[PDB]
Amino acid sequence: LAKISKIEAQKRKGRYNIYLDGKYAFPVAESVLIQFRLMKGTELDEKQIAAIATADQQAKAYSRMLDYLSYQMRTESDIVKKLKEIDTPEEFVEPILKKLRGQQLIDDHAYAASYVRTMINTDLKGPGIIRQHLRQKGIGESDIDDALTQFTPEVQAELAKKLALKLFRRYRNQPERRREQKVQQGLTTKGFSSSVYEMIKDE
């Protein structure tokens, strides 16, 4: 069997160069070096050297998700979509999601809440549409309902009055009945329930 004659750190931290019997053989991420207990004197068969490779291929995709997460907030579906984008073997997806989840580098519940807050601060969308958008982002109904809790009727009526005033001005050219209906319908397609118009109408 081959025996490790040396282990040298590469210039950048996190990876190592492995020499077998005095000659360079292969590199391994730190986690793989640990996962396989590599050190000066370790003997290896082909099956192990191949399994080390597969593990290092996974460790590398993990590292890249670490860089991906360092730029901005991401949902789980963003990570999945990202691993798929750089053609990661499908058997690595779930393990990496699990590993990232375990290190809590991803959190869909915190994401949904932040999303709603940002919507409340920069948009005029209603719960129905927010709910629809988060469902598309892969978030369960429980995490969506929790996030939609910030959407109180006061906030709803606040965002709806603003939208309605903007809709009433946008369709100022239409007659009485058509103008109002257009505003009612507009609010509903924006995610606001029927009982919301019957609350801000007079205003």
Q: Domain limits at 126?
A: 107-151
Angstrom CA distances, 160 to 90, 155, 182, 193, stand at 44, 8, 14, 10
Residues 48 and 135 in one domain: no
Residues 189 and 128 in one domain: no
Place of tokens 């290092």: 56
For residue 129, what is the DSSP state?
H
The β-bridge partners of 27 are: 17
b (16+ CB within 10 A) / e for 77-110: ebbbebbeeeebeeebeeebbebbeeeebbbbee
Residues 40 and 84 in one domain: yes
Residues 18 and 37 in one domain: yes
What the block records as the tokens of 3 is: 């025996």
Residues 50 and 132 in one domain: no
Number of domains in the chain: 3
Q: Resolution to 1 decimal, in Å?
A: 2.3
Give the method of determination: X-ray
Cβ neighbors of 72 (< 8 A, separation 6 or more) are none
